[PDB]
Amino acid sequence: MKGEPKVIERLNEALLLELGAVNQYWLHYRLLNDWGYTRLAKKEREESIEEMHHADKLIDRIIFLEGFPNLQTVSPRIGQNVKEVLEADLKGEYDARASYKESREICDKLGDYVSKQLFDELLADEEGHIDFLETQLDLLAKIGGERYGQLNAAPADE
């Protein structure tokens, strides 16, 4: 099903953002683990693997539409503390959300309703991630960064 070039371009823009998030969440997993925040690190690892599945679905759609998937990554936000790490994740999610809103509208306008549906599902997922991250940052604000870190660290015998 030879796809619209403009739809393939939007799918490739999403792929770049998703691969960027895979890399950023994985680096955050390893960084948080080295800092001792092993519980939050595990959540970042789980979120990275979810973004990997998103990237896979975009690659599949691009190939189905007879486009060329461009697997590349623009490297950084890398914080120096747990608040900055969460804020960097959140910035990325807002950026993706804005991209996918524009993309679903382009796909609708061009009559590719199945690609539209893919962007709608990504959009719902990103708002879920935003909801989660905003809550974590609200908790950090309320209890303080040191108790937030303690809450998200394991004792030494685990």
Q: Which residues in this chain contact ligand HEM in the complex, by CB under 6 A?
A: 19, 22-23, 26, 49, 52-53, 55-56, 71
Q: Which entry of ligand HEM, Cl ion, Fe ion, none binds 40, CB below 5 to 8 A by partner kind? A: none
Smallest separation (angstroms) from Fe ion to the CB of 85: 15
Q: Are 106 and 119 in contact (CB under 8 A)?
A: no
Give the x-and-dash track for 117-156 against Cl ion (CB under 5 A): -------------------------x--------------
Question: Hey, what amino acid is at 93?
Answer: E
- Residue 30 backbone zone (phi > 0: left; psi -120 to 50: alpha; other: beta): alpha
Task: Quote the CA–CA distance of 133 and 86 in Å, as a whole number.
Answer: 7
Residue 144: CB atoms within 10 A of its CB come to 11
Among 5, 34, 91, 109, binds a copy of itself (CB under 8 A): 34
Question: Would you give the binding string for a copy of itself spanning residues 40-79, x where CB under 8 A is met?
Answer: x-xx--x---------x--xx--xx----xxxxx-x----
Q: Which two tokens stand for residue 52?
A: 């990997």
Binding site for Fe ion (CB under 5 A): 18, 46-47, 50-51, 54, 93, 126, 129
Alpha helices in the chain (DSSP H): 5-35, 38-64, 82-109, 113-143, 145-151
CB atoms within 10 A of CB 111: 10
Q: Which does 106 bind (CB under 5 to 8 A by kind): Cl ion, ligand HEM, a copy of itself, none?
A: none
Least distance to a copy of itself, CB of residue 6, Å = 17
